[PDB]
């Protein structure tokens, strides 16, 4: 069952291979901490939803298969919101709408409708965890590549957003740097994502040729 | 058949609604506390703890003036006596309206000014924020008696306040808001001056 | 006026370039112009109807009963429901009509825009007419952007893009440059 975990990270990525879940990838990425928080929230909701659907797999009448599942997804999203608005309000204010916009997350619903309906609970859970770790890795790579170009600093205000216990991640790169403003702006997201896609293509081709 | 198509949808909606209600009864309480604490944290940045004793967000006034309209004066009484009043000002800038906060004492001396909401171009007129420059900290001892109505302008218009390199409209708006707030406090006596 | 609001929604506050809503179907269907036009018309209609229905449900059911925290659920459920109907009624009542609107309707069932726009409306507290105009503007902006990005991607399909950038990466770079070009309309309305 660990093979799916090892395969869902790079071979089948939610936003790098399947070309899904681009709205949170491009919108909440101005800081690495925001990307990590979004990735972990999506991993939590994915795991919970997948587990519940797998447990309740033996029914879900196909003719009404979509809304029913959406219902379940919506619940696990709404509760989630009402959790992080009550105990992580500082992180909730930054993410804003996109924590609520996980019901329509294409990756979540696609994985729900493509794996959960024909697999047991443990493989489902592991698959969801792998998808969420892949998402988090993407949202941390892009977040860092944008934050460094925008302000120079790596993960910032982690003590406030993610708690003081994560102070050790606060590391500054290129001290005395005013940073490029364009990276934070919307034009800086699409270009960075395209360059990451091309880099992935190149490294995949290099590995295939080495093979 | 129709049995599943409606029964399962209704059951999903009902169970999820019940769970959401169970979450709401717990979280509604703690969300109001977080928002009130955020409001208090924003207010405290301009109002030191020692000056005020009662809760400023419990005796909010509502005053009609001739120019600003309706205001949201928050008093800060130590022992039955007004010591500071905190209100907000709006003024058109370059990229849009600017909403700032003022915390002026009972004698007319400004205890601190912070800009709440603005939409100015970053890197050119973002110095109004207190986390990037100390310019917004200029208004800390000024009043309407030590500065006549000739120095309450940017240096471009013949005043005493510095202007940003390459941006003057935003400092003009901020200085105009501060002056209008001070004049508004001066006009409405007793309940705002003491 | 309403014309200024519509123009601001279409250009100043575009739902894709500065909203980041509905990017997956926008980047997956824009390879061909005709499917892009069909999906644009379908999503405009669906978003308008969804905004109207969401406003009606919020101001006639959710608020009077005191329950607001269910809003997301309610919204999506309703919209999903409606979309399904708008799909199947088109199948055989007008079979010729099921070649430009019905085929692309499955996609917009979960788009993040049909959900995004109504919640933003909710935040601003718009009335029924304002909510419908906001939905139609968001729709006509999604269209105006898809029917313009499809042309660029078709022009580039016949281009000489390097093998390491042909396809999605060049599309993302072009979208970034198109957002940087749309940035000039900021503050106009």
């Amino acid at each position: 069952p660990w093979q799916y975990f090892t395969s869902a990270l790079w071979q089948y990525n939610v936003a790098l291979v399947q070309m899904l879940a681009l709205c949170p990838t491009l919108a909440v990425t101005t800081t690495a901490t925001n990307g990590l928080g979004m990735g972990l929230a999506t991993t939590l909701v994915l795991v919970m939803t997948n587990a519940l659907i797998s447990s309740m797999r033996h029914t879900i009448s196909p003719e009404v298969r979509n809304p029913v599942m959406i219902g379940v997804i919506a619940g696990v999203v709404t509760l989630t919101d009402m959790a992080m608005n009550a105990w992580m309000h500082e992180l909730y204010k930054v993410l804003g709408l996109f924590i609520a916009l996980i019901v329509t997350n294409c990756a979540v619903l696609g994985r729900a409708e493509s794996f959960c309906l024909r697999n047991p609970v443990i493989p489902s859970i592991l698959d969801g965890a792998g998808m969420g770790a892949g998402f988090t890795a993407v949202l941390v790579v892009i977040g860092g590549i944008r934050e460094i170009l925008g302000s120079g600093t790596l993960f910032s205000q982690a003590s406030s957003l993610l708690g003081s216990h994560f102070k050790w991640m606060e590391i500054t790169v290129i001290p005395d740097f005013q940073g490029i403003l364009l990276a934070i702006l919307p034009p800086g997201a699409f270009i960075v994502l395209g360059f990451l896609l091309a880099a992935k293509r190149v490294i995949d081709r290099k590995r295939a040729e080495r093979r | 058949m129709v049995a599943y198509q409606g029964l399962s949808l209704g059951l999903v909606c009902a169970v999820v609604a019940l769970l959401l209600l169970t979450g709401n009864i717990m979280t509604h309480g703690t969300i109001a506390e977080q928002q009130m604490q955020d409001r208090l944290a924003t207010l405290r940045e301009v109002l030191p703890q020692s000056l005020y004793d009662n809760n400023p967000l419990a005796d909010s006034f509502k005053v009609q003036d001739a120019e600003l309209g309706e205001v949201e004066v928050l008093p800060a009484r130590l022992q039955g006596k007004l010591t500071a009043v905190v209100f907000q000002g709006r003024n058109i800038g370059y990229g849009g309206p600017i909403e700032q906060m003022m915390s002026v004492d009972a004698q007319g001396k400004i205890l601190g000014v912070r800009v709440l909401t603005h939409k100015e171009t970053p890197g050119l007129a973002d110095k109004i924020e207190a986390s990037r420059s100390d310019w917004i900290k200029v208004f800390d001892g000024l009043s309407l008696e030590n500065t006549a109505l000739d120095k309450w302008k940017v240096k471009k218009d013949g005043g005493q306040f510095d202007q940003f390199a390459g941006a003057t409209i935003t400092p003009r708006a901020v200085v105009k808001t501060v002056l209008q707030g001070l004049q508004f406090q001066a006009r409405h006596a007793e309940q705002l001056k003491a | 006026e309403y014309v200024l609001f519509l123009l601001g929604t279409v250009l100043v506050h575009n739902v894709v370039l500065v909203g980041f809503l509905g990017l997956c179907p926008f980047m997956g269907v824009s390879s061909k112009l005709d499917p892009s036009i069909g999906l644009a018309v379908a999503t405009t209609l669906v978003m308008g109807l969804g905004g109207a229905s969401s406003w009606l449900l919020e101001h006639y059911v959710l608020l009077p009963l005191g329950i607001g925290f269910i809003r997301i659920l309610a919204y999506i459920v309703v919209i999903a429901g409606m979309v399904q109907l708008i799909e199947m009624i088109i199948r055989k009542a007008s079979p010729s009509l099921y070649r430009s609107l019905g085929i692309y309707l499955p996609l917009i069932t979960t788009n993040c825009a049909v959900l995004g726009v109504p919640l933003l409306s909710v935040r601003e507290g718009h009335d029924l007419t304002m909510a419908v105009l906001f939905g139609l503007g968001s729709g006509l902006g999604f269209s105006l952007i898809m029917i313009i990005f499809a042309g660029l991607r078709e022009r580039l399909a016949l281009a000489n893009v390097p093998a390491a950038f042909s396809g999605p990466p060049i599309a993302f770079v072009t979208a970034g440059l198109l957002a940087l070009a749309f940035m000039g309309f900021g503050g106009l309305i």
Partner: peptide, 25 residues
């Protein structure tokens, strides 16, 4: 409660509508 009944009513209305639509068309 007065809310769950309304939620169930809207759900069963959507279900009956989709079922009748699928049957007739």
């Amino acid at each position: 409660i007065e809310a769950t009944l309304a939620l169930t009513v809207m759900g069963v209305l959507l279900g009956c509508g989709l079922g009748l639509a699928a049957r007739k068309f």
